[PDB]
Amino acid sequence: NKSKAKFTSLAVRSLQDRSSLVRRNSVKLLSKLLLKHPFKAIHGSQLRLSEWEEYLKGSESQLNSTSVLMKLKLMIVYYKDAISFIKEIHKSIELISNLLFSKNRNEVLESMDFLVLADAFDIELSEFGIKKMLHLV
DNA sequence: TTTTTTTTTTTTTTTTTTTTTTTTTTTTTTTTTTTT
């Protein structure tokens, strides 16, 4: 699970690569990572930045107010990892939305598939991606 | 249904044809000169 964040960061960085095939494969990797993630034990299949931030704030308040110490520590580090992953996915979504207008059709199709998958899970910036996709006519 | 083969397309890299400017040789007509 730890290497998942590294793979996501490398894929987001490679999204800006000059080669088109590399970009399509990075989009595929991000789609595969978003389709199944370890972040499903609690409130699975729902990636909302506001809700996760509120949950993290609640956990921080609970810790501020024997097993309790490290249990809250693990919960907080898990929530921080979730927030970082959500931010990375949001940045990747923005990059792919900017990347929608490409000469190669396979890249466009994979970008549309990734945006649809990201829209399937409730995402605040998914509507922007759908709006950008609407101009593909 | 699953796997293999074909063929088709997508690049990057190299190769091929086209041609725009860069110089040259020969002839022509006019003007001036010399000679009956």
DSSP 3-state assignment of A111? helix
Contact A61, A79 (CB under 8 A): no
CA A63, A64, A69, A73 dihedral sign is positive
Q: Is A129:A118 a contact under the CB 8 Å cutoff?
A: yes
CA A68 to chain centre: 30
A20 touches strand B (CB under 7 A): yes
DSSP state of A135: G
Maximum C-alpha span of chain A:
60
State how far the Cα of A51 lies from the Cα of A112, in Å rounded to an integer.
26
Q: For A44-110, give the DSSP string.
A: TT---HHHHHHHHHHHHHHHH--HHHHHHHHHHHHHHHHHHHHHHHHHHHHHHHHHTS-SSHHHHHH
Find the nucleotide nearest A107 (Cα to C1′): B10
Q: How was this structure determined?
A: cryo-EM
Distance CA A90, CA A80 (A): 15
Nearest nt to the CA of A103 via C1' is B10
DSSP A18: S
Distance CA A108, CA A97 (A): 10
Residue A109: CB less than 7 A from any atom in strand B: no
